[PDB]
Swiss-Prot record, chains A, B, C, D, E, F:
Places the protein is found: Cytoplasmic vesicle, Autophagosome; Cytoplasm; Autolysosome
GO biological process, one term: intracellular iron ion homeostasis
Main location: cytoplasm
Gene: FTL
Protein name as catalogued: Ferritin light chain
Length: 174, 174, 174, 174, 174, 174
């Protein structure tokens, strides 16, 4: 048996491995979204940058989970990573709606794992999620909702103008 | 005969002289495009700057070819430079479409010369084009395609507004 | 059709997408190797660091390929990422042998794509691989071979001592 | 009609366009002279540099004229640029004599345009030429005459020695 | 067999060893040329320095080839180094003509090896030569041709004067 | 006859040329030893560095002898350089034993030349060897003997472990 493992259930260990897969899937989704907005026939640099930075953040979250798995004496187990849900992501609005759906899914997985840790009286797990992930997720979802509202306000009768303006004046670009 | 010339065919020497003429023609075209956008009745400073900088880059490319011609022991031969294809260049969209056409023509001339150098087993020529020109061209054409997409998105029902916004918010200006 | 695409075959476009998948698979493999060596019952920090840094490099290589795909006017297409070949990676020697096998596979894929680009007279593709990947791969494989030789020399009759010493005295650690 | 044009005759507008062509022709001539002196079988670096710098100055003069054309509300009109008068330029002495002939031609065109502006009571045009071009031209022709005298003094009975010495000891080189 | 070797033919391996011998022979030739011009009865410091620096560069080129041999998993094999072709090298003109002959021989060996690598579909070898050697060689041969032209111009009827002047005013010295 | 030569015998002149050949042979030997230890199947970086630095030092010694030859008014005469005695150099111990043998041979040649200079009452030659070479040689041989002793101490029953440790903990490496 493990020389360090203490108060770390098999159920939590397994759910951590699943959450790693979810974060890596999210990272891959955001890589796809980022390169879609870099297409010459899409060409929204700020949208590309927004999603490339999220891909990086989600990968980091998976790495933090993996580090924690080892700190607790669990065993990292990797599974196939499913390809993102779409090959082409539509408008900035379509993309930002898909991103909010994805984030709510991740957030629910975090909440589910927190509730499992609570039930198993695993306060280190619960603290870990609170300190690394729960507020980051709430902040990110709020940011996406803010963006969605601004995107929606800009559609008007001139969708192309609005999509350009949002990319130029809200999102970070060179 | 030449004291330095080695593995440098008459066919390549001639094609290099032709490519010099093509780059100088492109430079002249961009000088014309730049000063058109500086007209008081056109007045798109960022568009002017974009094309003036390209004129400079294309002249530099011709100069690099001429330097290489001499390094190989070929003889620079200059021909008449034909005037650009238009005196007035229309909208920013018209201009950017003309520029992409021009660049694809230049790119094809580069590819043709590379294929000639390959056939003639002239690796110095092939390397020269790879290192100085092929990626620069691919990057420039990608940039132009990006610009075209943004310009097209902005036409909407309000072409003047969109042309102003693109010049103000995408292109570099004072 | 694409507004920028020029001299870029469907065969190359597809092979680039496949190569992206191979680099991302390699990255995932190295993530797994890195976290295996971070296990409390393995505990070889320098080995962990070696493979975590390779995971990062391979992801960057995939990103460069994706950037190039878009520069050429091809379309990025992502596929499922298969999980690494093992869940537990044995000794440092076992791991370094698996890594050399993986790298030779990647190198062969690079060479195959280069030969396709040559056959298709696609010098931008060929240059791209030469400049970004071929020498990096040769250097990495040489480094791994160097490491394998030192690891093998150290097995002697005292395998644990040798594995410790290699991690402490060859690999970078805190 | 033009919203800004005032006191700017069609005759002046046309003569400015012609003068632009003359300056660009002169620039092209100097590009040819510069690369001739860079030939491995000519190899006079200081002579090459002298003429390359003049090519740049003449292009700048054309650009200043074009800027002025637009400031006045005239319309830039480009014509074919004729190739330089020679493919091979002889000795430094031959070249410097050709350059003085070229500059006197340019100077006469400046004087002719100034006289037209005077006759048309166009003081902005006259000032423009005075401030940008007339003294620059007189200074350049004086410099060329100085150089010609030194070159001629050096021919003696040892032309090669003298041509080397002039390039080494009068002209700027690395 | 070799643990790292991949796509590296025995023909290329052998030709690399031969090219190493050629570069080391060239280095030795230039060492001899350098010390000849340091003789008290020759005494042309700038000529000495020119050839001593080339000796160093050629040795470095051999070392780069040897490094590459090992990176590819080939085996360095050294042969006897033949002494230079002359014990006394005549005038600066004689020496510079011998150097251009030597460099054209080296250049042809580079081109031959590049063609072998092309035929063997060895793009790493081809890139290596392109990036390290082909342009360096073209630049060096151009420099030598430039020097030869200036030396020849200076012979006139006063060979000693011209040889002094070239050494003092073209070549780098203390 | 020579304008500067004074008290410099033909016997010394010839022996200096021979000593130059010996130093260049030693340099070549050390180049071979250095690249052997850089093989992926040998992979002892510190051993490689040790011998590459000696190759450089021995070449410098030959150059100092050549400089002195010219200072005295003798004539440098180069001979064929024989290839090193082995293609593969065995273990670090084998290599260090071969190096000590080589250095003792060089040292004896120095002593022989010193004795010739003494017999010929050539104090400049004797001083030259004393100041540039004799103590450098004694110091180098002492260093090699120190290394041999440490290498021998480390063979024990675990030769690979000892060879690794010596390279890591005695020799300079990155
Ligand atoms: Cl799926
Ligand atoms: Cl025309
Ligand atoms: Cl699988
Ligand atoms: Cl004409
Ligand atoms: Cl011989
Ligand atoms: Cl031998």
């Amino acid at each position: 048996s493990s020389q360090i493992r203490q108060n770390y259930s098999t159920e939590v260990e397994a759910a951590v491995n699943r959450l790693v897969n979810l974060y890596l899937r999210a990272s891959y989704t955001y890589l796809s979204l980022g390169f879609y907005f870099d297409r010459d026939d899409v060409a929204l640099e700020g949208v590309c940058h927004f999603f490339r930075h999220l891909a990086e953040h989600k990968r980091h979250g998976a790495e933090h989970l993996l580090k924690m798995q080892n700190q607790r004496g669990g065993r990292a187990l990797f599974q196939d990573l499913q390809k993102p849900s779409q090959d082409e992501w539509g408008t900035t609005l379509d993309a930002m709606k898909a991103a909010i759906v994805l984030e709510k899914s991740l957030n629910q997985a975090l909440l589910d794992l927190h509730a499992l840790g609570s039930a198993q009286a695993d306060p280190h797990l619960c603290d870990f999620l609170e300190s690394h992930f729960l507020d980051e997720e709430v902040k990110l979802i709020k940011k996406m909702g803010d963006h969605l509202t601004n995107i929606q306000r800009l559609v008007g009768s001139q969708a192309g103008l609005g999509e350009y303006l949002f990319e130029r004046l809200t999102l970070k670009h060179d």
